[PDB]
Amino acid sequence: LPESVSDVRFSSPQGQGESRTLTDSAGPRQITLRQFENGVTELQLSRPPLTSLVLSGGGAKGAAYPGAMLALEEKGMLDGIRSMSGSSAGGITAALLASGMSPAAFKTLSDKMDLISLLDSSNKKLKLFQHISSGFSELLLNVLPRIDSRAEPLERLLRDETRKAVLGQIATHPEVARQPTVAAIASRLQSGSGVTFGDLDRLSAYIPQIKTLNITGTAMFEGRPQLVVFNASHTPDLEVAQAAHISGSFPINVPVPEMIDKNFDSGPLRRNDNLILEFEKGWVVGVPEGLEELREQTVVVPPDEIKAHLQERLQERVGEHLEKRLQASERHTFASLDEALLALDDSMLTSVAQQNPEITDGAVAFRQKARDAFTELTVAIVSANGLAGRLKLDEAMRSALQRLDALADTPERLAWLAAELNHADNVDHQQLLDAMRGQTVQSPVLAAALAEAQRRKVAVIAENIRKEVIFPSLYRPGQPDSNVALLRRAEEQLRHATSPAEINQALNDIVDNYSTTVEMAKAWRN
């Protein structure tokens, strides 16, 4: 071997030699930890909770759908579903199920509901395309008020059935029904209003039978498909019946990955599994969820007698899929035991500690101190009554940060603490990060958290550019292969961008080589 290739190591962790099992199937997630002669630690655990149901497409072919819901109910897994997502016509089904309809009720409705007739009837909802004459997704929303589709049979039906289901769930949970926010929702619905994405989000927190809803469609505008997304974050006050109706009326199948949400986290474990229902070699080397991972989560869907048949078939197929996923496992490899333990959420760590406290004592102490320090920080932030001023933060905040800094004794622990400080739902930590943005700070944990917050901000912008600029041109019918290649490359640049400069380079490469796409690129650049 020549000089240059004298020493060689694996660049990612790889177990070497024999391993010992540190913990065997601990807790509900069946956590198994194996450690090798070189310290590399392998984590094996069950698949994550099945919390997302994804309905890819819909229409007439959806006659089999009731069988999938019956299968979920049969296996006691319907209550575990937290969110429903549907693309194009699949939004209709997603909306009904998300509203709390029972599998039995849904089957009855689906069977005597003529979706072909209801969709065909939809009397020209192309007025939308015309009103958009005077990005896109926001223009579409702004024009709905000057459109009247509320009385169209399909929308009236969805509005009535979703409302009935939601009101029924509320009524069966009297402790929930009497809560002021819920009583306000019920009153509004009883007055004739329809269920909104926001209503579902608020109620799902109280009643497991009600789920959050995501409806996505692709709308052809000027020969380019535009991704239109309806959910509690983007359109909280929009009636789900109208969203399902509009989404179902578009003429370009929404890629499944567009319905699976991106989740920033402090570790590598997948937060949850999806059950993807759809009808009927790529080569990326990367730097020094996949379709295959999605395939593992997908079940292909297959006149009264026929309905019964297709439903029976799907129920059998979904039932087997649910049994088989219980036999599957997730695997992760780490360079040290502590990093494997940091990948475990608090409940998982506790489960392992109950079986093998000798391997977790250090990690449990770290976790307890971190949680206590995070609380102290929150107390300091909220009790400060403002994080602005000539002097940076205050003594109480400094003290909390100092405790966190002391816990950051390894690069892995520093990274974990910084990611934990970035949780999007923590209003108080978020106020701290916003308050200190772009400033030099003494706390290494706060400094790392600020850097991570900036990287996340860039990733969010990159994702919007992908959806608004790249997606429409990438999936435009007739797009020459050379442009597709250019666009794929831009997608890669966007996936890896960590600074505004890297985003700008991606935009420049499109402007300089693409043969409105260029216009949108220049728009984002400035």
Partner: protein, 119 residues
Amino acid sequence: MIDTWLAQWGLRLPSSNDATLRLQPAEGPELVMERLEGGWLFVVELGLVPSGLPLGVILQLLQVNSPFSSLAPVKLAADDAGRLVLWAEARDGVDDVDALNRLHDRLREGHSRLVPLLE
């Protein structure tokens, strides 16, 4: 044989037959090894293809693929995401330790000659 080839560096093929392995020598590029049903795909990454390369550079890159190139049998390609790469295929039962070292050497030689051209 791959395990014997790895043994040169005191390494062993990990028992968790994962589809992709990555090697990092003290000097030079990371070597990405992808398992092919009946062999291996050896790859070294050169970054995304830059915009605006001069014709001479484009020619030099394409010339790597000449059947008579000194880098033979290494090939220069771009992956689906536009990442420039040098690759070669190791076929089980045909390429011994010397053959594998030769592929690695050519991949490295190609990498060193080209990276500077991609500013």
